[PDB]
Every structure is written in C-alpha cells, then in structure tokens.
Amino acid sequence: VSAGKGIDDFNVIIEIPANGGEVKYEYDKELGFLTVDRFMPTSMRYPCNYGFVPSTLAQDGDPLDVLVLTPVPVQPGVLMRVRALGIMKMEDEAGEDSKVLAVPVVKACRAYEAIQSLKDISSLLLDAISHFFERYKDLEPNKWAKVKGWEDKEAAKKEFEASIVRFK
C-alpha cells in the first residue's frame, strides 16, 4: 500500500477507533491480518481514531503513527485518505514517538473543510488528546509517556517526509 500523495493527502490504516481502546489492535502486514496487541485495563478511551501510514518508518522502528479526527469512529482495519494539521511530540519508555494529527481529505469530509491547521482545533480537544497519552499507561507496569507538546503542519510535513525516506 502506497503512503499516499503527500502531507495533504496520505493513506492511513486505522487500528483503533475513536472511543475505543479497551482492546488495542495492531495491523500485521506480514500475515495481512488485524491482530490483538493488548487489552487495556483502564478507564481511558481514545479521543480520536488511531492508525499508521503504510510504507513509512519512524524512529520508533514502526510506521509513522497518526491520530485522525472524524465526525464518527472508523472501523478498525479500514484504510482512509487524510491531511495533516500538525504533530504531537512525545516520548515513552522506548523513546521518542510523535503522532501526526490529521483529518479526512476534503473530498471525504465536507464538515471539516474549514479546519485547515492546528489553530482551527480547540485547545480543549488538544488538551484532552495530550491528557489521554499522558495517562493511558499509568496502570501499565514499566510503561510511561510524556507529551512534549504540539507543533504545526510544517513540522508534521517534515516528519512525514523524513518517514518516507527512512522507508526504502
């Protein structure tokens, strides 16, 4: 699967739906199956859809992670075309592991057409997202996470581009 055209139109395979999280799925490219990663014994729920960009490689060693805001949750395993608004910088027990924040391309979501950059997102929503990643590992032995903050679309673009070159 291609990574997509670019930062304004790239592909994302959804692993976890908005409002999900009690079970964490991970896509297994080798087997071509959506797989169970872990059951999360906590009261936290994903504030948005969660997935990765195919044909990319982040420092983490996994494909680039993506957070996707949508009007309603998307079924895990589904592929969708999105555009970046910015990027969330964070680190966990493994190291640095930022997540791009995206919405669907205009062709797929007219309701979000007015949302063009990170500033068009309420700080409240960003706070809730940051809060989720700050705390969702609280009850997991040996696991932790710290959100450094948010950066703009250009930062997202750079990490996206660098992610393409790192792949192949």
For the bound state, the minimum distance from the C-beta of residue 110 to Mg ion, rounded and expressed in Å, comes to 12
Taking Cα atoms as reference points, which of 37, 7, 32, 5 lies closest to residue 22? 37
According to the binding rule CB under 5 A, does residue 15 interact with Mn ion?
no
Residues whose CB falls within 8 Å of the CB of residue 103, separated by 6 or more in sequence, listed in order:
68, 69, 70, 82, 83, 85, 109, 112, 115
Amino acid at the residue 43? S
According to the binding rule CB under 5 A, does residue 65 interact with Mn ion?
yes
Binding string, 1-30, against a copy of itself, x = CB under 8 A?
x-----------x-----x--xx-x--x--
Q: How far apart are CA 8 and CA 144, in angstroms?
A: 31
According to the binding rule CB under 8 A, does residue 51 interact with a copy of itself?
no
Q: How far apart are CA 129 and CA 7, in angstroms?
A: 21
Residue with tokens 């581009």: 161
**Residue 50: how many CA atoms within 13 Å on its side-chain side?**
19
According to the binding rule CB under 8 A, does residue 72 interact with a copy of itself?
yes
28 or 62: CB nearest Mn ion: 62
For the bound state, the minimum distance from the C-beta of residue 9 to a copy of itself, rounded and expressed in Å, comes to 13
Could you tell me which residues are annotated as the binding site for substrate? 24, 38, 50, 136
* Binding residues vs Mn ion (CB under 5 A): 60, 62, 65, 97
* Binding residues vs a copy of itself (CB under 8 A): 1, 13, 19, 22-23, 25, 28, 31-39, 41-47, 70-81, 104, 107-111, 114, 122, 124-125, 127-129, 131-132, 135-136, 138-141
